[PDB]
């Protein structure tokens, strides 16, 4: 990044010692933290299950929520909607010195973990976590969520198929509210946008002069002779280093923000997903009957089944 | 050792500039560590409020079982918790029946799921084979027996 | 990382990159002598408000009258240097020839106008080459007087660069075309006073300005250099007409233009060139790079390594082994294997395996290592399940897995004597 | 902050790239995030 390469300039970096080593230490640890994010957010269950594909439980169909194995990929359809929705503004080989390195956790395996949690959360017991699963048929499960929302099970079984429609159309209204729709996706857009902004900013910083005769290497080494060389080269290197170091600083701040949200991310993959997160205005904006995961580029989208009671009696007390 | 007034100080100021950016970098990164470390420290105080002063019933929060107790111990610069979790480990196999359909009316139990329809004997808890004689308080008057999946008679 | 005992894992270490091999020099077959010895030894050297201009086109610029002469009054290159001068092939450098008195050399720079260089010949502020000067007091400055050549010293103000008016304006300070000897009505003509016994600041300096029109075409004028042959698909060196560098060459895919040479694709990095002998060639300069990062199992078990490369296709990499092109030039080092997918690249020292353990050391994209092997990944504890309805388990035993958890509640309380 | 009125200081500030742009952007988004916070903490109310 600094010092594309000619000859002099590596020695001129080593005039400032271990600075390349510090930068790569930082960004490496950053990358490792992103791996950790993907793990502790994602690698939360050893006991992975088969995608059971019964896909109808009492009345309650997970159409396109799950992947559907007769497709070529084992992605769920909503993930793919999300992929095509999110813009992105052989080998990936620049020579800006930069790399969007691929993850550890491969995108199919991302989807496999998420979808496995979808399955084993839709199946496989409200008891989910300490243990593996206890063969619980999903009407007992969200009936247990009614018990954890403060009501009986009459509300389930006597509204059963009604509930189905009340959920399932809702899912399809999800498939309304996600298909042609709008910027209720905004935060991951912001992440990728700020990445592009910082990164393209950093590129333009390589195009940025720092007062020197040129703003590029080796065109200076078209017309220099002597110490003047290392004069403007050191100006370049300190300016490029300040830019790059401000970059590293801000990336680290992004890591801090992103990992606070990632603590939240694993938190809602824990408390919202694996049981009922009984705290209030936390998961969605209702009472949290359920919530589901969804894989996403650089992030995740949770699917919050709230419970919004809205009519009125008026009775004396 | 070869100092003049001016140009020597310019070299000195180069050193001051480098050392100062480096130190200021150290400051800034320390402060980053401070922010990270204090979010975690607030977490630590939070857990020592929840996990240590009681049982944090929110699940997989203190312990990676179901958090029965927790125990702090000090450390250089940090702290180490001992999570008294709860990881259940065995299995039954029985059938279920969400009602107790005895006289033509339905009985949804105690909400707290799985009526023990292990030959419709009793009603059990969430996490142990924990039977209950079906009586007036194992369930309530729950509509009538129409959307049931199971029927349990001989409620006396 | 400064330890004998070092634990297990991909640990970072330094870069790796590929040394170029070839020396591609691509100049046109332009072969000529410049008018250098014509301009700097002319019979004609004019005044400054009547400054001579010369274009120099399709030459081989030796710069060999330049370095071996003590005759020069000011042999000075301002925005450029004298020694790296024939390093690039030029398009139409521009000589600006004039006769000054002995003190205008200081008065010629980006800046440094005074009256003479602002009322006779105006200078730029961006592109510079070299100024050359000498005295000719032995022929031009005749001690009886050489009042033949002149300058101008009366005008309404400053000038833009490279701009000239021959017009003898009989000046008056608000227009008003006068006939001198009227009041505030003079002519700007002023002789040079050039004597053989004239002062040092009065010497006739025949002075040439060199503007360097720097590569606004596929250019013309090279230096005494040696154009070489092309290589494709191999990291080589460059020196094109106004370009240098190190890269991997392949042909272009353009809608390339006739006036055109460069491509700068993402930003300012040239990324495609037109050869000066009619070829259209992309210049993917990233020869190969990335950083090495050593797999090691921990030295309580091994010293068997594997060197994980990053921005690599494992194809020029086995070459870089067996043509010795890796800048971490290793001594005791073979080609046992080359596992390559998961486009992070070259893994010299492990094997394709389907037996998927718990993914010890995560490699690149999904691949992981054990023992030493490098399989992809176990996704976890797989389960085949059929969640039917009534069938229900409830546990009747358990454990108390007291775990650690580690929360750093302080850092080291540090402080700095910033005064020391 | 950096030179209010100038010819040259604006020119050399152009010569140092998009610094000012990033700074404006960063503090602006800081402002925007605090307003976000002002919505996020306070403005939970459906019906006043």
Could you characterize the architecture of this molecule?
The structure is cut from a larger assembly and holds 4 copies of chain A. The first copy, chain A, is mainly α. Helices cover 51% and strands 3% of the residues of chain A. Chain A contains 10 helices and 4 strands; from the N terminus they run ααααααααααββββ. The first copy, chain A, has a two-stranded antiparallel sheet. Chain A has a two-stranded antiparallel sheet with strand order 2-3. In chain A, a hairpin with a 2-residue loop joins strand 2 (295-296) and strand 3 (299-300). The longest helix of chain A is centred in the last third of the chain and has 47 residues, at 228-274. The radius of gyration of chain A is 26 Å and the shape is elongated. Chain A: The record marks 75-76 as: Cleavage. Chain A: Residues 160-210 are annotated as: Heptad repeat 1.
Summarize the structure.
By secondary structure, chain A is mostly helical. The first copy, chain A, is 51% helix and 3% strand. Chain A has helices at 8-14, 19-42, 77-85, 107-122, 139-147, 154-157, 160-179, 186-207, 220-223, 228-274, and strands spanning 290-292, 295-296, 299-300, 303-305.
